[PDB]
Design an enzyme around this catalytic site. Structure first.
Site, PDB file in Angstrom:
ATOM      1  N   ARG B 158       0.825  -1.210   0.000  1.00  0.00           N
ATOM      2  CA  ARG B 158       0.000   0.000   0.000  1.00  0.00           C
ATOM      3  C   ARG B 158       0.861   1.263   0.000  1.00  0.00           C
ATOM      4  O   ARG B 158       0.519   2.255  -0.650  1.00  0.00           O
ATOM      5  CB  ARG B 158      -0.977   0.004   1.185  1.00  0.00           C
ATOM      6  N   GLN B 181       4.958 -12.569  -4.563  1.00  0.00           N
ATOM      7  CA  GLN B 181       3.914 -12.829  -5.554  1.00  0.00           C
ATOM      8  C   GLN B 181       3.596 -11.543  -6.323  1.00  0.00           C
ATOM      9  O   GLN B 181       3.623 -10.453  -5.742  1.00  0.00           O
ATOM     10  CB  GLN B 181       2.648 -13.378  -4.880  1.00  0.00           C
ATOM     11  N   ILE B 231      13.056   2.465   3.598  1.00  0.00           N
ATOM     12  CA  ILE B 231      12.157   3.003   4.629  1.00  0.00           C
ATOM     13  C   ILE B 231      11.430   1.905   5.416  1.00  0.00           C
ATOM     14  O   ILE B 231      10.623   2.191   6.296  1.00  0.00           O
ATOM     15  CB  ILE B 231      11.111   3.990   4.044  1.00  0.00           C
ATOM     16  N   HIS B 281      13.884   7.485  11.603  1.00  0.00           N
ATOM     17  CA  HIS B 281      12.577   6.813  11.514  1.00  0.00           C
ATOM     18  C   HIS B 281      11.399   7.802  11.639  1.00  0.00           C
ATOM     19  O   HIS B 281      10.630   7.775  12.606  1.00  0.00           O
ATOM     20  CB  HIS B 281      12.484   5.659  12.534  1.00  0.00           C
ATOM     21  N   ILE B 282      11.270   8.682  10.653  1.00  0.00           N
ATOM     22  CA  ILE B 282      10.240   9.724  10.701  1.00  0.00           C
ATOM     23  C   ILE B 282       9.187   9.595   9.597  1.00  0.00           C
ATOM     24  O   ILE B 282       8.554  10.584   9.205  1.00  0.00           O
ATOM     25  CB  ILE B 282      10.848  11.149  10.707  1.00  0.00           C
ATOM     26  N   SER B 284       6.079   8.541   9.612  1.00  0.00           N
ATOM     27  CA  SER B 284       4.730   8.969   9.968  1.00  0.00           C
ATOM     28  C   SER B 284       4.681  10.253  10.807  1.00  0.00           C
ATOM     29  O   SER B 284       3.603  10.660  11.278  1.00  0.00           O
ATOM     30  CB  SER B 284       3.996   7.835  10.698  1.00  0.00           C
TER      31      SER B 284
END
Lengths: 313, 315
Positions: B158, B181, B231, B281-282, B284
């Protein structure tokens, strides 16, 4: 054979083009530093054609130095206001420049500057290095996202259109634009509404000048959470007013690819602020683009020195 | 009353939702600093529900410390590797997480990272600050544009799609996707060709890992002028290998949002390379998204205490 002077070491594709011209005798300042007026005012003397950079100022003072002998000046920039161009379009001399070929790149850099500023990347890079990063933290280093945002573009030209185009898929719900004349058909792609300057400052979450208007009055009217981007000229921003608004909270953050003057002295007030990203005019700084500019500038010069029409005049 | 334990100070919207719940007593580790294991043990004791963060390694030792009472573990994250799922399943404990809610924001950062790396923004910023900027130079600080380029997306889920969606208007000519897959239905949007892992690395100009796969074998096949971006997780990158690649000019540049471990020691090799950008680790990190993550993680927990259907549950 004709006299051709080049002011600077240019990217290969332009150099190759000029090297392949048996037509000309090319003399080169084999240096990366901008040739000073003293060496330029003896360089251009007796020259039919000159290839010059954004750095050089070509004026009634240099055009005389060259005399009737010069037929074409080709510059390696979209920017025009460094050539005396109405002393030029004067002497019946033909002018070359490099537009359109840098559009996608500059608009890409504009978005790149915008993204890096609002998502607070430089500050993030520094905390990693300085030891500020201790753990994953819910409320730490939070930025402002483009999702559901309102973007204002001052100057919806070919360059600004390329900006909205890129921003569209970021979840932007509303584009606003302002300028001298309203553009109807090129605005429909993003549904960009034409508004007053106050209205654009009042509504926008992000503002991008793609063209001094941008002063204290403008910054007061901006959202306190808004981000301000400028890629056009430096002189559209009142730099003291920008410092005051950024330092006191009138606006959230600013990103600048252009400044007054260029370069900015290392000790400038704007460089002491953490909510102000400054770049050294890298709008068109890619291998592909700089090469194409080089070649487009080379072909303009040759076309003029021979008598033909030009790809960009 | 049902005891609830929160391993951190979470955003207001989630914190408030917990406060309003009449059938609960909320106890909390009131800090933005991570709770030590020793303290987590005393914290979960006899708690019916646990709201944790990806930092808190909820394993058997901690599950033992809680006891029979524990019915739900709600983590404020999409990533779930910090939970010992095998033993959680063994005790019939329900697990909630936060996918979707962060799709756009994380996609946003990935493109941000990419753009700032390929256009050499950090290197340029420093050059104005240290006096490297002397004039407009026609060959200085030149990066690699996204026009007419080839982009390779590893793990086109997504987030993967969302990155591709945003990168299309930058004039990219071809996309390539990799997984266990193929996903032809949900990837017609970009004309993405399904290729293998090794075939991607050679063909693409920009690679994005979104989900030790990326090693000395992986960076050798890549183009001399390519940008690597990760990421997902730290584990998938061999960090001493990545350094060897970047230093020797085997690949052009790299940008990471995740590392092994987190945080990286401030004396790590990678942090000395000009052409390597590291973000803490930003993905979000925006006020509105974290606030929403907070609210969902809280709703997951309350429903999992009341025996109700959870908005976003891991099976």
């Amino acid at each position: 054979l004709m006299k051709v002077f080049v002011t600077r070491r240019i990217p290969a594709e332009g150099r190759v083009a000029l090297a392949r011209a048996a037509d000309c005798e090319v003399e080169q300042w084999d240096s990366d530093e901008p040739i000073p007026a003293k060496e330029l005012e003896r360089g251009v003397a007796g020259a039919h054609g000159l290839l010059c950079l954004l750095s050089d100022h070509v004026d009634k003072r240099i055009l005389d130095a060259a005399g009737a002998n010069l037929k074409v000046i080709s510059t390696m920039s979209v920017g025009i206001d460094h050539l005396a161009l109405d002393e030029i379009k004067k002497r019946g001399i033909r002018v070359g420049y490099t537009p359109d070929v840098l559009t996608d790149t500059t608009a890409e850099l504009a978005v790149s500057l915008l993204l890096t500023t609002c998502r607070r990347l430089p500050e993030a890079i520094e905390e990693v290095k300085n030891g500020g990063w201790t753990s994953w933290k819910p409320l730490w280093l939070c930025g402002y996202g483009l999702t559901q945002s309102t973007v204002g573009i001052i100057g919806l030209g070919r360059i600004g259109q390329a900006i909205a185009r890129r921003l569209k898929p970021f979840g932007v719900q509303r584009f606003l634009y302002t300028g001298r004349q309203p553009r109807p058909e090129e605005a429909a792609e993003f549904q960009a509404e034409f508004v007053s300057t106050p209205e654009l400052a009042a509504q926008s979450d992000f503002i991008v000048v793609a063209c001094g208007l941008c002063n204290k009055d403008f910054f007061q009217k901006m959202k306190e959470t808004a981000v301000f981007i400028n890629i056009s000229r430096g002189d559209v921003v009142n730099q003291d007013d920008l410092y005051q608004a950024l330092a006191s909270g009138k606006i959230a953050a600013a990103g600048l690819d252009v400044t007054s003057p260029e370069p900015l002295p290392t000790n400038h007030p704007l460089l002491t602020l953490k909510n102000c990203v400054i770049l050294p005019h890298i709008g068109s700084a890619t291998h592909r683009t700089r090469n194409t500019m080089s070649l487009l500038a080379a072909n303009n010069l040759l076309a003029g020195l021979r008598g033909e029409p030009m790809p960009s005049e």
